[PDB]
């Protein structure tokens, strides 16, 4: 019969909300039901899905649903499982979901589980058993335990190869990787089936067999055989050869744009040589959209259309170039700054912001970015922005010094010889948050190693803490040129901290003991004695000093610079004290003070101006800070043109040799002309100099003879040029490189007043590592 509704009673839910439903319901009260209303209702109330099952019951005017309304996941457990992780795929599997409570349905499940088996049949593993078992617990929810077992894996043992017939089935199986039982896959694990891995393999069997000439070339069929226990996999490949033939031409057919046809005579190069190399071709396309999109055009799809003149057989096509609006830059975002400071990157670089995009001006960035070593990748990801077109954002990715890490580092000081370094370090061990690293160097002069342990974050604003222990031997006999007969030998350790007290200005400290192990062997200078005599003991002979120092160290440094390669204005500055405390034996001190103004007078040419100024007394118990701590002169550090160390106060010594002592004040200046290549005229890859230096080094001491044997001719010849005199000059020009082998400085440089008693080396350099 038929009805009119007055009133309905829903019994069931518990707990969900009716009148979220009297409102879902396509009647009312007061409403004519009739049937149709009696299943479309209950069909309507199945969707949405709050329900296992309803049903629908007219009584005496009265409309009662009864519902069971549906479970809800308390909590759901993966565990087989060893080829992939567990929670990566809960993870993968609340994404259908299946989460907490989640209003839970076997129909989900079904096809989740449906959905992990063609994970595991898509890489090896080819049996394999996943067993859901849901187990309805209290109140009104329900707990999903997924427990796998992985079935071990499939292993290839034959590759074949049908029809080929031009190429070895050898040749074509070392195309792809992915290969029959091999003596050496246990490690490897080369015949571990994979899908897409099978995927690649025979794309790369068709690159090869594309770059080889060969167009057409259809994959036909890939039969992949099995066995039981689904362990051992044949894989049987079936292939169309190509024609193989040959090239057409050529360019065109478009298009009106900022770029035009030109590009068709250099970007187009290959010549009608027969053998078609779709290497090639996808290359050419390459710097084809490279020089598109320097202007503007990022998108600018092409499309190759083909010409099989073929009964020639040969073909040909025409590049069909479809280029779009064009886009500029709106904002620019950057990647992982641990480690490192994005304030910093955002600045060398080309493009920025609100600019119109350009490929070769990205990629320069990419170029520049990563000649800094600071990252150890880069990539450059186009965001189409908003909902707005010839608009983009822009993130490029960073990846840095991949945290621990081997290092090996080869350099070459001029008069010296080869120098190199090794160390080792690890970021962050373990989940410590804490650093440390083990770093050693080894020239014909120089032995120096050390440890080291820094807290990188000390403070919440970066603040440094360290502490090192190391030792130093120096032993400038040996190498060609000389500083002194002696050698001294250093093992220490200390504290430091640094304090990035603004984001141009960081102060550092440091407090250390050395022993320092001082030797004047000899017969050898006279200053060097009367060291040893007031303050060592004598076996000789030779001579020692042995003592300790106690050490405090302060540094600071501003740095505002438009740039880290190649600054264009913005200046450096530095300021360096050491003193050897009360306590140590010796107690000298030190200081230094920097600067390099850096100009802009053109966009080729910029002005470099600076100079540094330094003080070495000695205090108390000490006059006469020792020597083996003094200043010393000359070579690129200084003035070029002069030999090092040579600048200063020098005497002879026995068989003929004129060693130097340096001295205890320092002046330097100089000024640079600095200009890229000869154009270039912006970009620098190598940077080039012209510089007139005047340093000078010395002591306000006086020197008559000291051995037979005098090296100047009179006796003073003082030491001066703060009364000023001890000082040389010169002029000349550099080329600065950045090799991908460390920086290469090169040097020629004109000494002007030249002296008789004054070592001279017109051409330096310095090839990399240990500056």
Same mark, same amino acid.
């Given at each position: 019969?038929? @009805?009119?509704?007055?009133?309905?009673?829903?019994?069931?839910?518990?707990?969900?909300?009716?009148?979220?439903?009297?409102?879902?319901?396509?009647?009312?009260?007061?409403?004519?039901?009739?049937?149709?209303?009696?299943?479309?209702?209950?069909?309507?109330?199945?969707?949405?899905?709050?329900?296992?099952?309803?049903?629908?019951?007219?009584?005496?005017?009265?409309?009662?649903?009864?519902?069971?309304?549906?479970?809800?996941? #308390?909590?759901?457990?993966?565990?087989?499982? !060893?080829?992939?992780?567990?929670?990566?795929?809960?993870?993968?599997?609340?994404?259908?979901?299946?989460?907490?409570?989640?209003?839970?349905?076997?129909?989900?499940?079904?096809?989740?589980?449906?959905?992990?088996?063609?994970?595991?049949?898509?890489?090896?593993?080819?049996?394999?058993?996943?067993?859901?078992?849901?187990?309805?617990?209290?109140?009104?929810?329900?707990?999903?335990?997924?427990?796998?077992?992985?079935?071990?894996?499939?292993?290839?043992?034959?590759?074949?190869?049908?029809?080929?017939?031009?190429?070895?089935?050898?040749?074509?199986?070392?195309?792809?990787?992915?290969?029959?039982?091999?003596?050496?896959?246990?490690?490897?694990?080369?015949?571990?089936?994979?899908?897409?891995?099978?995927?690649?393999?025979?794309?790369?069997?068709?690159?090869?067999?594309?770059?080889?000439?060969?167009?057409?070339?259809?994959?036909?069929?890939?039969?992949?055989?099995?066995?039981?226990?689904?362990?051992?996999?044949?894989?049987?490949?079936?292939?169309?050869?190509?024609?193989?033939?040959?090239?057409?031409?050529?360019?065109?057919?478009?298009?009106?744009?900022?770029?035009?046809?030109?590009?068709?005579?250099?970007?187009?190069?290959?010549?009608?040589?027969?053998?078609?190399?779709?290497?090639?071709?996808?290359?050419?396309?390459?710097?084809?959209?490279?020089?598109?999109?320097?202007?503007?055009?990022?998108?600018?799809?092409?499309?190759?259309?083909?010409?099989?003149?073929?009964?020639?057989?040969?073909?040909?096509?025409?590049?069909?170039?479809?280029?779009?609006?064009?886009?500029?830059?709106?904002?620019?975002?950057?990647?992982?700054?641990?480690?490192?400071?994005?304030?910093?990157?955002?600045?060398?670089?080309?493009?920025?912001?609100?600019?119109?995009?350009?490929?070769? !001006?990205?990629?320069?960035?990419?170029?520049?970015?990563?000649?800094?070593?600071?990252?150890?990748?880069?990539? @450059?990801?186009?965001?189409?922005?908003?909902?707005?077109?010839?608009?983009?954002?822009?993130?490029?990715?960073?990846?840095?010094?991949?945290?621990?890490?081997?290092?090996?580092?080869?350099?070459?000081?001029?008069?010296?010889?080869?120098?190199?370094?090794?160390?080792?370090?690890?970021?962050?061990?373990?989940?410590?948050?804490?650093?440390?690293?083990?770093?050693?160097?080894?020239?014909?002069?120089?032995?120096?190693?050390?440890?080291?342990?820094?807290?990188?974050?000390?403070?919440?604003?970066?603040?440094?803490?360290?502490?090192?222990?190391?030792?130093?031997?120096?032993?400038?006999?040996?190498?060609?040129?000389?500083?002194?007969?002696?050698?001294?030998?250093?093992?220490?350790? #200390?504290?430091?901290?640094?304090?990035?007290?603004?984001?141009?200005?960081?102060?550092?400290?440091?407090?250390?003991?050395?022993?320092?192990?001082?030797?004047?062997?000899?017969?050898?200078?006279?200053?060097?004695?009367?060291?040893?005599? !007031?303050?060592?003991?004598?076996? #000789?002979?030779?001579?020692?000093?042995?003592?300790?120092?106690?050490?405090?160290?302060?540094?600071?440094?501003?740095?505002?610079?438009?740039?880290?390669?190649?600054?264009?204005?913005?200046?450096?500055?530095?300021?360096?004290?050491?003193?050897?405390?009360?306590?140590? !034996?010796?107690?000298?001190?030190?200081?230094?003070?920097?600067?390099?103004?850096?100009?802009?007078?053109?966009?080729?040419?910029?002005?470099?101006?600076?100079?540094?100024?330094?003080?070495?007394?000695?205090?108390?118990?000490?006059?006469?800070?020792?020597?083996?701590?003094?200043?010393?002169?000359?070579?690129?550090?200084?003035?070029?043109?002069?030999?090092?160390?040579?600048?200063?106060?020098?005497?002879?010594?026995?068989?003929?040799?004129?060693?130097?002592?340096?001295?205890?004040?320092?002046?330097?200046?100089?000024?640079?002309?600095?200009?890229?290549?000869?154009?270039?005229?912006?970009?620098?890859?190598?940077?080039?100099?012209?510089?007139?230096?005047?340093?000078?080094?010395?002591?306000?001491?006086?020197?008559?003879?000291?051995?037979?044997?005098?090296?100047?001719?009179?006796?003073?010849?003082?030491?001066?040029?703060?009364?000023?005199?001890?000082?040389?000059?010169?002029?000349?020009?550099?080329?600065?490189?950045?090799?991908?082998?460390?920086?290469?400085?090169?040097?020629?440089?004109?000494?002007?007043?030249?002296?008789?008693?004054?070592?001279?080396?017109?051409?330096?350099?310095?090839?990399?590592?240990? @500056?």
């Amino acid at each position: 019969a038929d @009805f009119t509704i007055q009133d309905i009673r829903v019994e069931g839910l518990q707990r969900t909300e009716p009148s979220t439903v009297f409102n879902y319901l396509p009647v009312k009260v007061g409403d004519t039901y009739n049937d149709t209303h009696g299943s479309a209702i209950i069909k309507s109330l199945y969707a949405t899905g709050f329900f296992d099952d309803v049903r629908v019951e007219t009584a005496d005017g009265q409309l009662l649903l009864t519902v069971i309304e549906r479970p809800t996941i #308390g909590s759901l457990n993966i565990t087989g499982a !060893k080829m992939l992780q567990n929670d990566a795929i809960k993870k993968n599997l609340e994404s259908f979901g299946l989460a907490q409570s989640q209003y839970f349905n076997q129909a989900t499940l079904n096809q989740a589980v449906a959905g992990l088996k063609e994970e595991y049949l898509g890489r090896g593993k080819l049996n394999i058993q996943i067993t859901p078992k849901v187990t309805k617990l209290a109140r009104n929810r329900v707990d999903i335990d997924i427990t796998i077992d992985e079935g071990k894996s499939a292993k290839i043992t034959d590759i074949e190869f049908e029809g080929n017939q031009v190429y070895s089935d050898r040749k074509l199986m070392r195309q792809m990787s992915l290969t029959e039982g091999g003596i050496w896959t246990w490690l490897t694990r080369s015949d571990r089936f994979d899908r897409q891995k099978f995927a690649q393999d025979m794309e790369k069997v068709t690159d090869f067999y594309q770059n080889n000439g060969y167009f057409d070339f259809r994959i036909l069929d890939t039969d992949i055989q099995t066995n039981e226990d689904k362990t051992r996999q044949t894989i049987k490949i079936t292939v169309h050869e190509g024609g193989r033939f040959r090239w057409g031409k050529v360019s065109i057919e478009g298009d009106t744009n900022e770029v035009p046809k030109a590009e068709l005579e250099k970007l187009l190069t290959m010549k009608p040589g027969k053998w078609y190399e779709r290497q090639q071709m996808t290359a050419v396309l390459g710097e084809i959209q490279n020089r598109m999109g320097s202007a503007g055009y990022a998108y600018s799809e092409i499309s190759v259309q083909p010409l099989p003149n073929a009964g020639t057989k040969t073909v040909d096509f025409v590049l069909h170039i479809e280029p779009g609006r064009k886009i500029y830059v709106n904002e620019i975002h950057i990647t992982g700054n641990n480690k490192t400071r994005d304030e910093v990157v955002r600045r060398e670089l080309r493009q920025m912001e609100s600019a119109p995009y350009d490929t070769s !001006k990205l990629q320069r960035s990419k170029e520049r970015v990563e000649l800094l070593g600071y990252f150890d990748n880069v990539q @450059f990801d186009a965001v189409p922005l908003a909902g707005t077109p010839d608009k983009v954002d822009l993130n490029m990715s960073l990846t840095e010094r991949s945290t621990g890490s081997l290092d090996l580092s080869a350099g070459w000081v001029q008069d010296t010889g080869l120098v190199m370094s090794a160390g080792v370090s690890q970021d962050n061990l373990f989940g410590t948050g804490k650093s440390a690293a083990l770093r050693a160097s080894r020239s014909k002069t120089t032995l120096n190693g050390s440890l080291s342990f820094t807290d990188p974050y000390f403070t919440a604003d970066g603040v440094s803490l360290g502490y090192d222990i190391y030792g130093k031997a120096f032993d400038p006999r040996k190498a060609s040129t000389s500083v002194k007969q002696y050698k001294t030998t250093t093992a220490g350790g #200390g504290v430091r901290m640094g304090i990035p007290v603004t984001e141009y200005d960081r102060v550092n400290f440091g407090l250390a003991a050395e022993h320092l192990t001082v030797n004047t062997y000899n017969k050898a200078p006279k200053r060097y004695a009367d060291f040893i005599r !007031k303050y060592g003991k004598t076996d #000789g002979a030779d001579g020692s000093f042995k003592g300790l120092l106690y050490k405090g160290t302060v540094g600071w440094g501003r740095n505002k610079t438009d740039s880290a390669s190649w600054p264009t204005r913005g200046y450096l500055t530095g300021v360096n004290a050491e003193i050897a405390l009360p306590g140590s !034996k010796l107690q000298y001190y030190s200081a230094t003070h920097n600067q390099t103004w850096f100009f802009p007078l053109s966009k080729t040419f910029t002005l470099m101006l600076g100079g540094e100024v330094g003080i070495a007394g000695g205090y108390g118990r000490t006059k006469e800070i020792p020597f083996f701590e003094n200043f010393y002169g000359g070579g690129l550090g200084s003035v070029r043109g002069y030999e090092s160390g040579t600048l200063g106060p020098k005497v002879y010594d026995e068989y003929g040799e004129k060693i130097s002592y340096g001295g205890n004040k320092k002046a330097n200046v100089s000024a640079e002309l600095l200009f890229p290549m000869p154009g270039a005229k912006d970009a620098r890859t190598v940077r080039l100099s012209l510089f007139a230096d005047a340093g000078s080094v010395w002591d306000g001491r006086t020197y008559t003879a000291a051995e037979n044997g005098n090296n100047k001719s009179v006796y003073s010849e003082n030491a001066h040029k703060s009364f000023t005199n001890e000082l040389r000059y010169s002029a000349g020009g550099a080329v600065t490189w950045l090799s991908p082998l460390g920086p290469m400085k090169f040097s020629y440089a004109y000494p002007l007043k030249k002296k008789p008693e004054d070592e001279i080396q017109r051409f330096q350099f310095q090839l990399g590592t240990t @500056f």
